[PDB]
Design a protein around this ligand. Sequence first.
Ligand SMILES: O=C(O)CNC(=O)C(=O)O
Ligand SMILES: [Mg+2]
Ligand code: NI
Ligand SMILES: [Zn+2]
Length: 331
Amino acid sequence: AQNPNCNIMIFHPTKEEFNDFDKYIAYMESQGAHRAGLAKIIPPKEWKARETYDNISEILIATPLQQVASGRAGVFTQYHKKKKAMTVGEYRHLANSKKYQTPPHQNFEDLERKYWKNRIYNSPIYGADISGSLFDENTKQWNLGHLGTIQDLLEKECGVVIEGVNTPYLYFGMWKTTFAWHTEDMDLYSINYLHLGEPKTWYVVPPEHGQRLERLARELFPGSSRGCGAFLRHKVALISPTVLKENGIPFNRITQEAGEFMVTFPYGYHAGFNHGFNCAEAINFATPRWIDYGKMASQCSCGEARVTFSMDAFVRILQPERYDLWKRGQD
Ligand SMILES: O=C(O)CNC(=O)C(=O)O
Ligand SMILES: [Mg+2]
Ligand code: NI
Ligand SMILES: [Zn+2]
């Protein structure tokens, strides 16, 4: 069995290997990459996402989200307070202001210590989930707006044609902006490209051990667990590495830098934080190996998780027994 310790693997494809996206994902899996839940892909030196980032300041963040924490430093939830619209140029200036800028630090490890010590005492503002793309249309390799769609994959594997679309999303971050512990909708893959700016630190639980994280989360967030049998779908709960180690939960960590891709694999729980002003692009995708995970994915039916139009068909076809209850949670 490849990668039996479930370590995060780092790949360096050549320009030739970068041509065929599906083939490269299957390659990485042949080497055991999925066992970690997360992999890093460093593009060949010849590749670029676009020519420059000099002209992005007029992109609108219609609903910036202020991430307000409650709890203790290593075990907290966050809620998202909506703020007034602002442009990327306005947000960048805000991120660089004395109130929000990255503090002085020695290295990534020191910054990670500071994040876990101090996150809860601040409320950073995140531009998340903005439909759009920063890939040049002429970038032919690993262009996250030109991937094969999940609807087409389900149709190819299962024969059923379904409605829905699959487009990328932009994320504009600042120091301490936080992504809570989650798997993807329908336990899909994700791919994330850090276009510019400061790093993003990731934490991940191997898919084979995801239920250990879920059981800890039910212990640590007992009211939320009574409210919903899949409350991590709400994407609000944070647990620090120190707390995970105290409770014996298997996990790994890695820092993504600008110019790097990360892939999350089906049922790989992940969480993390941004180091400073940055912009990332991410999208979900599927492969044949996903289908079995999609059929078994948990679902939130309490009303909180509320998701895209396109998840309807995935539930309806892969999880017909759950469909009626889930759809009630959508309405
Ligand atoms: O970058 C972020 O804030 C969160 N991204 C992801 O969870 C991802 O790409 O799957
Ligand atoms: Mg612009
Ligand atoms: Ni994710
Ligand atoms: Zn719920």
